[PDB]
Amino acid sequence: TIHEFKKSAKTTLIKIDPALKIKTKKVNTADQCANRCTRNKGLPFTCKAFVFDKARKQCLWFPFNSMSSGVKKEFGHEFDLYENKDYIRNCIIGKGRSYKGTVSITKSGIKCQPWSSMIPHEHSFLPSSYRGKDLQENYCRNPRGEEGGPWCFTSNPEVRYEVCDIPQCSEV
Amino acid sequence: TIHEFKKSAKTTLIKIDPALKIKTKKVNTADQCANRCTRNKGLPFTCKAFVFDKARKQCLWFPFNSMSSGVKKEFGHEFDLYENKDYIRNCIIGKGRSYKGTVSITKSGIKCQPWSSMIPHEHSFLPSSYRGKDLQENYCRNPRGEEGGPWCFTSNPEVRYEVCDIPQCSEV
Numbered sequence: 001t002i003h004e005f006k007k008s009a010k011t012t013l014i015k016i017d018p019a020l021k022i023k024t025k026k027v028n029t030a031d032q033c034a035n036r037c038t039r040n041k042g043l044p045f046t047c048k049a050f051v052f053d054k055a056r057k058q059c060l061w062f063p064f065n066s067m068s069s070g071v072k073k074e075f076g077h078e079f080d081l082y083e084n085k086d087y088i089r090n091c092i093i094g095k096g097r098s099y100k101g102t103v104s105i106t107k108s109g110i111k112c113q114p115w116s117s118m119i120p121h122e123h124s125f126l127p128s129s130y131r132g133k134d135l136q137e138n139y140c141r142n143p144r145g146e147e148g149g150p151w152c153f154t155s156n157p158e159v160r161y162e163v164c165d166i167p168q169c170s171e172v
Numbered sequence: 173t174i175h176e177f178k179k180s181a182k183t184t185l186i187k188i189d190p191a192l193k194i195k196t197k198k199v200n201t202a203d204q205c206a207n208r209c210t211r212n213k214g215l216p217f218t219c220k221a222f223v224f225d226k227a228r229k230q231c232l233w234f235p236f237n238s239m240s241s242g243v244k245k246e247f248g249h250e251f252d253l254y255e256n257k258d259y260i261r262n263c264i265i266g267k268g269r270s271y272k273g274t275v276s277i278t279k280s281g282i283k284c285q286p287w288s289s290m291i292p293h294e295h296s297f298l299p300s301s302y303r304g305k306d307l308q309e310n311y312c313r314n315p316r317g318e319e320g321g322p323w324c325f326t327s328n329p330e331v332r333y334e335v336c337d338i339p340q341c342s343e344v
Contacts, residue, residue: 004176040277040281040283043281044280044281045279045280045281045337046275046277046278046279046281046336046337047281048337063281063337067343069343069344085257085258085262086257086262086273086274086275087262087339088262089262089263089339089341089343090257090258090259090260090261090262090263091261091262091263091341093341101258102258103218103258105212105218106218107217107218108216108217109212109215109216109217109218109219109235111212164218165217165218165235167259167261169261169263169265169341170265170341
């Protein structure tokens with residue numbers, strides 16, 4: 001069940017508004033935290049995210065994710081952040097510059113090439129180069145905010161890049 | 173992997189658009205269609221949904237869902253529809269009247285009471301009547317279009333009903 005969460009390594013979140021509440025608990029594996037989050041059992045809220053402290057083998061279930069207002073994230077090798085896809089807007093607004101969804105396949109059905117690889121296609125579109133644009137894994141993105149919306153370098157050598165078929169949130 | 177699809181028993185989809193392409197194949201089980209869809213390995217498009225023909229134990233992979241334009245659904249006992257949640261708007265527009273996501277947990281974190289149940293709470297919100305409102309399972313909904321957004325009757329005898337924390341597509 002831990003696979004249906006967007007994972008961001010060495011990350012955790014921090015709150016600000018005292019009202020915003022948490023629930024923690026020692027555990028064995030990060031898997032263990034996912035089941036409880038997904039099932040939303042014994043939790044005084046909606047599990048939209050959780051962190052697993054690999055160091056203190058702990059689960060940190062949150063009623064919010066990295067894009068929640070009033071919460072910032074922090075570095076930690078020992079931490080691993082898992083966000084519930086059901087709470088990460090999966091549709092596009094405008095040119096889709098703020099799309100953080102997990103679609104990784106182009107419109108014609110071809111798997112996206114990670115932004116970390118220069119194979120098959122070489123490129124200067126590196127994560128460090130574009131901060132805030134979430135160029136993680138091989139997720140369809142639109143760092144430059146171009147007309148076509150989110151796209152990705154294809155794993156098919158003949159197709160340098162292509163657009164992804166992510167829907168618009170509201171286009172009547 | 174089939175659990176990451178919204179299921180609509182006895183249902184299938186009929187394209188109207190001739191371009192909009194499909195791909196079919198005999199298979200053994202419906203799970204078999206899911207894996208192929210999720211992976212999107214042998215398809216010339218983005219799998220957003222698929223139908224499993226229990227009769228002809230067949231798979232119909234679609235580059236669209238029940239809310240795609242130019243495609244109508246049809247009834248059929250031998251058919252089951254599965255839509256990729258990654259393509260079913262997961263945020264709310266306005267009062268949330270057209271919400272079709274699968275969130276089934278009120279804001280305080282309690283499981284929803286399916287609409288087909290009169291226990292714990294009895295009600296006048298049944299599928300039968302108010303249709304087109306997808307009162308399936310225990311999905312948070314807003315058939316009437318009320319102020320607070322999609323909600324549900326709580327499986328907690330102490331709480332008649334409560335609202336869910338489904339994000340608005342206009343984040344904040």
